[PDB]
Amino acid sequence: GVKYTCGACAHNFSLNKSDPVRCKECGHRVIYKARTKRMIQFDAR
Amino acid sequence: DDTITTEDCWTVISAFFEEKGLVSQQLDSFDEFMETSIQDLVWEEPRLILDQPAQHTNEKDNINKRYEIRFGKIYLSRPTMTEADGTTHAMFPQEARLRNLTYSSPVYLDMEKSMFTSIDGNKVHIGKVPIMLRSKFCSLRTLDEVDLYKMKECPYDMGGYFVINGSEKVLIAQERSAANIVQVFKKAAPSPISHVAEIRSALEKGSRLISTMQIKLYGREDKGTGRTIKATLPYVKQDIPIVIVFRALGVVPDGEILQHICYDENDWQMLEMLKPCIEEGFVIQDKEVALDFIGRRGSAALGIRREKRIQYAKDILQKELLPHITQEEGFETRKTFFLGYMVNRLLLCALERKDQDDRDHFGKKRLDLAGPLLANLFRILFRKLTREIYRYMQRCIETDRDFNLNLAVKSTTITSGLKYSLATGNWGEQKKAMSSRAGVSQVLNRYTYSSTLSHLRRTNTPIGRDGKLAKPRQLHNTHWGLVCPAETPEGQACGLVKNLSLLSGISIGSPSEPIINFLEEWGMEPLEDYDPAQHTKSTRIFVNGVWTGIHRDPSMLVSTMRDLRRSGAISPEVSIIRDIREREFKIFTDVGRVYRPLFIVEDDESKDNKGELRITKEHIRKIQQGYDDDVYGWSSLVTSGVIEYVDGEEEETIMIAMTPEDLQTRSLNDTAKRIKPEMSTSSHHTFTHCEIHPSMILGVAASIIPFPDHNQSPRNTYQSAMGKQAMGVFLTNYNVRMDTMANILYYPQKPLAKTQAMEYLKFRELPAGQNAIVAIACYSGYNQEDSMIMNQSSIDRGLFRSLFFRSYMDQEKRFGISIVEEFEKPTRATTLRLKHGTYEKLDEDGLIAPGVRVSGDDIIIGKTTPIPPYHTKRDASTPLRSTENGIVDQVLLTTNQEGLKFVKVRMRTTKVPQIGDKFASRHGQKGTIGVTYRHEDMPFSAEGIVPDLIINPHAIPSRMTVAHLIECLLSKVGSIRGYEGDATPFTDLTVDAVSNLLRDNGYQSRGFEVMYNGHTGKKLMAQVFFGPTYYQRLRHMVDDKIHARARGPVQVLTRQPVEGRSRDGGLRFGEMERDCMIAHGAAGFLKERLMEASDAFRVHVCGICGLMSVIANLKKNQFECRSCKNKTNIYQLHIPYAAKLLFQELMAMNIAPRLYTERSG
Amino acid sequence: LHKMSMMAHRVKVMPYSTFRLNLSVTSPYNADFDGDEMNLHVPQSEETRAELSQLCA
Amino acid sequence: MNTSVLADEFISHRLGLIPLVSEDVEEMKYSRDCTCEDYCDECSVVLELSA
Amino acid sequence: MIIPVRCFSCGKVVGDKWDAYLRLLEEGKQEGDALDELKLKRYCCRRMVLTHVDLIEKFLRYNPLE
Amino acid sequence: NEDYARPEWMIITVLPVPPPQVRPSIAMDETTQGQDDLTHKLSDILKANINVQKLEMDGSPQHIINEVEQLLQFHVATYMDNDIAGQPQALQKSGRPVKAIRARLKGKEGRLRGNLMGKRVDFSARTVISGDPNLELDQVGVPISIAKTLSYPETVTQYNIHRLTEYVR
Amino acid sequence: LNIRCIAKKGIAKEHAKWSPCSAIAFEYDPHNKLKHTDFWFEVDAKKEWPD
RNA sequence: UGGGUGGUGGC
Ligand SMILES: [Mg+2]
Ligand SMILES: [Zn+2]
Ligand SMILES: [Zn+2]
Ligand SMILES: [Zn+2]
Ligand SMILES: [Zn+2]
DSSP states (O other), X not given: OOOEXXXXXXXXXXXXXXXXXXXXXXXXXXXXXXXXXXXXOOOOO | OOOOOHHHHHHHHHHHHHXXXXXXXXXXXXXXXIIIIHHHHHTTSOEEEEEOOSOSSOSSOOOEEEEEEEEEEEEOOOOEEEOSSOOEEEOOHHHHHHTTOOOEEEEEEEEEEEEEEEOOOOSEEEEEEEOOTTSTTSTTSSSOHHHHHHTTOOTTOOOOOEEETTEEEEEOEEOOBOOSOOOOEEOOSSSSEEEEOOOOOBOTTTOOBOOOOEEEEEBBTTBSSSOOEEEEOTTOSSOEEHHHHHHHHTOOSHHHHHHHHOSOTTOHHHHHHHHHHHHHGGGOOSHHHHHHHHHHHTTOOTTOOHHHHHHHHHHHTTSSSSTTTOSSSSOHHHXXXXXXXXXXXXXXXXXXXXXXXXXXOGGGBOOBOHHHHHHHHHHHHHHHHHHHHHHHHTTTTTTTOOOOSSSSOXXXXXXXXXXXXXXXXXXXXXXXXXXXXXXXXXXXXXXXXHHHHHHTTEEEOOBTBOOOOSSTTSOOTTOTTTSOSSOOOSSTTTTTOEEOOTTOEEOOOOOHHHHHHHHHTTTOBOSTTOOTTTOSSOEEEEETTEEEEEESOHHHHHHHHXXXXXXXXXXXXXXXXXXXXXSEEEEOOOTTOEEEEEEEBBOOTTSTTBTSBSOOHHHHHHHHHTSOXXXXXXXXXXXXXSEEEEETTGGGGOOEESSTTSSSOOOOOOSSSOOOOOOOSSSSOOOOEEOSOGGXXXXXXXXXXXXGGGSOHHHHHHHHHHHTTOOSOSOTTTTXXXXXXXXXXXXXXXXXXXXXXXXXXXXXXXXXXXXXXXXXXXXXXXXXXXXXXXXXXXXXXXXXOEEEEEEOOEEOOBSSSSOBOEEOOOOSSSEESOOSSOOTTOOTTSBOOTTOEEOTTSEEEOEEEEOOOOOOEEEOOEEOOTTOOEEEOOOEEEEOSSSSEEEEOEEEEEEOOOTTOEEBOSSSOOEEEEEEEOSTTSOOOTTSOOOSBOOOGGGSTTTTOHHHHHXXXXXXXXXXXXXXXXXOSSSSOOSHHHHHHHHHTTSOTTSEEOOBOSSSOOBOSSOEEEEEEEEEOOSOOSTTTOEEESSOOBOTTTOSBOOSTTTTOOEEEOHHHHHHHHXXXXXXXXXXXXXXXXXXXXXXXXXXXXXXXXXOBTTTTBOOBTTTTBSSSEEEOOEEHHHHHHHHHHHTTTOOOOOOSSOOO | OOTTSSOOOEEEEOSSSSEEEOSTTHHHHXXXXXXXXXXXXXXXXXXXXXXXXXXXX | OOOSSSOHHXXXXXXXTXXXXXXXXXXXXXXXXXXXXXXXXXXXXXXXXXX | OOOOSSOSSSOOOOGGGGHHHHHHHHXXXXXXXXXXXXXXXXXXXXXXXXXXOOOHHHHTTSOOOO | OTTTOOTTTTSOSSOOOOOTTSSOXXXXXXXXXXXXXXXXXXXXXXXXXXXXXXXXXXOOOSSHHHHHHXXXXXXHHHHHXXXXXXXOOOBOSSSOXXXXXXXXXXXXXXXSTTTTSSEEESSEEEEEEEEOSSSOSSEEEEOHHHHHHOOOOOOOOTTSHHHHHHHHO | OOEEEOOOOOOTTTXXXXXXXXXXXXXXOTTOTTOOSOOOOSSOHHXXXXX
C-alpha cells in the first residue's frame, strides 16, 4: 500500500510484503518510503 | 626574471596541489600493491610438492608421484555483488554504503597443477581483496563529474580509505623502526653491559623481519675487567663470543680479523682495547670447531653428529644471520666486512669519538602504509592458503580422486581474515589476537571536512605506553616540514602522534638494481679488491643497508647522480644523499621515507644563478598557461631540475635560508617589521636550499590558524586539536549518504582572516563556522575566566544553528532453514516483552513513515522473531535514543548481504546553540556560552553595531595570545575595505599597515570605539576594542553530558549500578572522593554512600562456625548450619553485595573468612 | 586533591541547563570554564544532611 | 509537500526571517489572546504557496 | 550556502541583494565598491554578504534525485 | 593453629563449587547463553575428573595415569590463577585468556578497588558548569531537569504536611 | 514544494524574527565636554580620535 | 535489556 519510491526510476510502487524488492525497470534494489499523509508542523524560529 | 615574490610561490603550490590533490600516500602505494605486490607474493613461493613414493605395502612400486601445483597470474576487476538471486552486477560505492556491503573485488587465480612422472582448477575466486575508494582499480578513478553526480560521488571528495562491512575504515601509517642501519646505543648503568651495536634485519623484496643480531659490550665503567665483547645471535639461547663467531663465519686467524676490522695501526687506544678480545678468544682456533661450539648452544640437536650439527650451524650462518644482505653464500667478505664496520663503529662510540646515536633523528625511521600492510597480511593468509591446499591434497590422494580444485578452495579464508583484520584492526590472524599491534585501522571520522583531511594523513607510534620516557615524546628537531609542530592531541597520545605535513610525500619502493647499475656505471670498485691498508681513504657506499663497494671521489659522482635526479634517469623520489665526514655515501630507496621538497638554490659558482633561486618567471608563466610552449604540470617541475626532494637523512647535509628575500644579503631601525638573523659567519655561503614557504611547515589542521607565529605554542597545539571538532560541511552529498554521525552547520562563512593555504583544503569553499563580532570587554562578570556573552537576537537570526543527522541499522537473522525473522508491527498479545514505550508510530510494515514527528523512547524498527518451538513471538525492537527528538527524513529499506531484508533509518533534528554549548576561538581562548543577552542589552558602538561574542580581558594577558588581537584588527579592516586579507604567516604584513589603513578609512587607529552601556548609555569610561573574527563550533554540547540517576539498571554479576551514559549508569564515587570524606571525617555520609545508594545486601551467619552457610527459608522461617547442626546461634548482617562476592570467591578458593560479632582477644 | 575538593552548598534552581557557581569558589576546586565536569551527590537521609551542613559547608 | 534540496525547519527558519508589511497591525491582536482555538481568519495571514 | 535574510549583527534585510551583487560583479566591479553602491555602510551588512560562499549550486548539481 | 589452620588442610581433596551467581549465564543474543568462564572451567575440571576415574577402573598404562592426574592439577591451578610463571596461560575459545578468581581480585578494576573501596553509585548527577557572580558563596545553580530526576526523601512529619501534599499535586 | 504558513503577531522579546528595525546609532556630547568618557591614548588625546 | 575486547576525544 505504501508508495515505496524507487531509487532509480522514481516509480511509486507498493509491495504486498511478498515481492522481492527491486526496480521494475532496471533491477535497482533500493527503495525508500515516501512522505506521510499527515501534515508536518514547524515553528519557524 | 625578477624577484620571486610570495604569490609566485603560491603559483608553485597551485601546481603541486593540482597534481596530487591530497592523499597521494594512500592511492599511489595502493596502486603499487595492486599492480605488483600480489603478483610477486604469489610468485614468491609458487610451488608445493607432495609425494607418496614407495612401499604403499607395495610390490616395491617405487614411483615418484610428485604432486606439483604452480600458482600463476592473478585476475583483477571491478567489485561484484553476486545476489542471493545469483545475478552479478556492477556494485558501486553508493550501493556499497547503503547496503552494509564490502566494496570487494573478485581476485582470481589460475593453478598450474603438474605431475612428475619420474619413477624410481581454473579461475577460482581465491578471495575478496577490498578495493579502496578513488583508486586505479576502483571504478571511480575516471568518469566525468557530471556522471559522478549521476553516481553520487562529490568532486571535492578525495577518497584514500577502504570500505568494510559497509562502514569506512582508514589506514594509519604505522611507524616501524628502520631496518639494516648500523646503530650504536649506550646502555643504562646498573648492569655490566654499557655499549651496544644493534640491527634489525628485513629482506629487500618483501620488507619482512627475519633476524636481530645484537652486540653487548661486557664491561661497565671500570667494572668487568676483561673489556671484551660477545655476540648474541638469532636461534641461540645464550651469548657467544665475538672472535668465535668471526671464525665461525669463515675468518679464523687473528691477523685477518684485525685486517677486516681495524683501519688504523696507529689507533693504539682502540687497538689497546682490542687485544683482550683476541686473548680471550684463543681457545677456539679454527673454523669447524667454532661451528661445533655454536652447535652446542644454538639448537643443533643433541646426538646429531658433528657433520649435521655443523650443517645446522652453517644454516644459521647461511640463512638466519645477516639475511637481508644476502641469503646465498660466497660473500663472507660482504658479511664479515659488514661486521667489521660494526666492530669499527662500536669501538668508535665506546671511546666516545662521537655522541651516542639517538632514537628519534627522523631519518633513522621509516613508515608503513597500506602497501606494506597488505603485503604482510596477504603474505600471512597466503601461507595459510598454502597449507590448506596441502591438507586437502593429502586427503584426496590417499583415496586417489581427480580433484577439480573448485571444492578445494573454501575461499572464506582470506576474505574472512582481511574482513576481520580491518574490522577491528587487531592486526593478525584472529588466533593471534593478543601479542599483536592493536588498533591499526580506524573508523574514519566525518564530523567536519578538515577533520577528515587530517585524519587521512595521520601516523601513530608503537612504543606502546610502557615507558614514560620524554625522549621519544620530544619535538625532535629533524621535524622541519615533515610533521606538525602544532598538532598532537592532548594527553596520552602526546609526543607520539605525528600528522604528515602539508609537504609530506610517501616514497614508494623502487628497483634498487638500476641504482646499483648507476653505481658500477662509473667505476665503483667491488668489495673483494678491498684492503683498507691499501686504501684507507676510499668512500664506502650504502644501498639501503648493504655496503657494496668503495670509491675515491664522491663529488663528481654526486654531481652526476644528483643531476640525474634533476633530470630523471632515477626515480625522482629516491634520496641520493652525500656525506663527506665518514668517507661514506648512502642511497636509500627504502619504502616509507618521509620526503619533502625545497626550492633548488643554485648552490654552484658556475653562473650567475648562484645564490639565486633556479625557478624563473618563465616557468611561472608556463604554469599559468597550463602547458609548455611546445601537458606541463608539477611532474615536469620535478623532472625539470627546479625542485629536489629530501628526506630526513639529507636534512643532515643541507643549508637553508627561510625566505627568498634572504638569499640576497639585504639592506633602518623600523619598529614594525621582523628581524631575520644576519648570517655573517660564512662570508661566502653556499646555500643549497631555500624554503618554498614557511607556512608549509605546518600540518593540515595547523595551516588553518590565522597567524600561528604570534602565540604561546600550547595554544597552537590546542587550536589544531580543536579544529577537527568544527561543525560544518563534511561532504556535499549528505542527501544520499547514511552515516551514524553527521552535522551540517547552517551558514558557513569563509573567514576574513583566510590564509593563502586554505585554498588547498577548500575551506573557503566549505567552511565550518562564522564571523561573529568580538568585543573583548568585561561587562557584567559573566566572562570571568573564559565564559562568554552571546546576543540571543543574533542566534534568532540564525547564528550557528545546527543540523543533526544520525543513521540507525537492523537486519534479519535466520534461526532455521524454515525459521527466519520478520519486521512487523507486534501485537499486545502474541508477542513477549513489549518495550515500555508505545508502538503507535509504527506502520503496517514495521518501519515508521517519514514526515512523522518522533520522540525518544518509542519504536522505529520492530524486529519480531517468533520463538522457535500462545505467546510465541519475541519483541526485539530497535528504538530511538532516550535523549532525542526529531522528524524523520529518508527511511531506507533493502536486502542484505544475506538475502533477507535490511534496514537503515536517517532521523534528524536541529539543535539551537544555547547556554553551555562550547565554542572556540581560533587561538584557543575557549569556553562555553556563559549567558544570553537580548539585543538591546548589549553594549553598542556609535553606529549601532552590537556584538555577539565577548571573550574576557582576563582571558588574554597570561595566555599571551597576541595573534588573536591581530586577527580581530585585520578582520575589521578587511571587512571595511571589503576583501580578504592575506594572513598567511611570516610575511611583511606588520601591524603598522593595518593601523594606518583603519585610521585612513575614517576610524581609530588601534581598534577602539566609544561604546556604551545598554542600560544607560552613560558612556563606557574606557574605549572598548571591537570587531569581527572567525568562530567555530566544537562538537560537544550540554545536551549530551547532562545525566542524573535515581536508580535503575544494575548488573547481574555484582549488583552495583551500571557503567556508561548510554544505559543511564551511575557515577564512580571513587577512591580519592572517599579520601576526602575521611579527611572531613563524617563517616556516616560514607556509610550512606557505600551501603545505601548501592548494592545493599543482607546475609546470615551461624554464630559458631562463623560462616554464611545458613540456608534461609523465610515463609517457613527455618534455618540450619548444616556443618554444625546449629539452629539457634544465628544472626543476619548488612554488608555490600560485592563484599559477599569476595566471601564466596574466597571460600571457593579455600580461605575461610569467619565473622564473629564480638571482640575476643 | 585536598580536603576542600568536596564542599557542601545550597540549592538554587535555574533554567538553561548548566551548573552555576560563585567565582570565588573557582580557586579551591581548581575549575576553569573550558568544559569541566563537576558531580553532585545527594544525601538520602537526615543524618548525612546535617553531616554536610555542619562540616563540609 | 516538500521534496527539496533543503530541509524543512531550515525553510521555516528562513521564512521566519522574512519582512512583511505590518502598517495596519495594531488592529490585529496578539496570537496568545485571540479568541480562537487554532488558527482562523480573525488573527492569521495564511500563506499557502506552491511553486 | 545561500544568502541569509537579515544581517547577523544589525538586522537590515539583505537577501534580495545577492543577485544584484552577482550582476554587479559580472561587469568587473570591485566587491567593496559593489557593496558601496548597494548602500551597505555598516560592516554588519558587509560581512553578511562579503564572506558568503555558495553551496546550493553544488546541491543542484545532483542530476535528479527522483 | 589447630582449630583454624591445620596443615593437612593446605592440600585440596575436595575443591568446592560456588553457586552460579558468581558465574551467571549471559544472554549472548537473547536466546543462547554464553557461559561464564568459571562454568567452562568447572566443566573442564569435571571432565578431567571423570577421565581420572576412568583409568583406575580399567587397564592403565601407568603414565596415562600420570598425565591425566597432572592435567587435573593443571585445571585446579588455572581455576584460581592464570598468571603462574613459566607456563603458558589457560586459553579460551576466542584466543583470549581465562578470567580466573585471581583476576577477579587484583588490579585496578577488581572487586575491591573497582567495587568495594571505591565503586559506582546512584543519586549522582553530572554536567558542564558556568560562572555566575550574581550569587552567594554557598550556592550552586541547578538545571530543572536534573532537579526533576534526582530527589530527596523528606519525612512526612507533623510540621510539613501541607507543602508535601502540594508536591504530590 | 507546497507550503502553508500562518502569520501571527509577536514582538522581539519572544524571538528576533519579530525585529521591527535594524540598527540604531546613538551619541551625545561629541566633544566630551562632560568628560564622561576618558580616552585611551598613546601620545596625545586630540590628534588620534577622529571627529 | 547483554557481555567482552579495542579505538578515538573531553577536563
Ligand atoms: Mg581546564
Ligand atoms: Zn527505477
Ligand atoms: Zn556453624
Ligand atoms: Zn480568531
Ligand atoms: Zn549587517
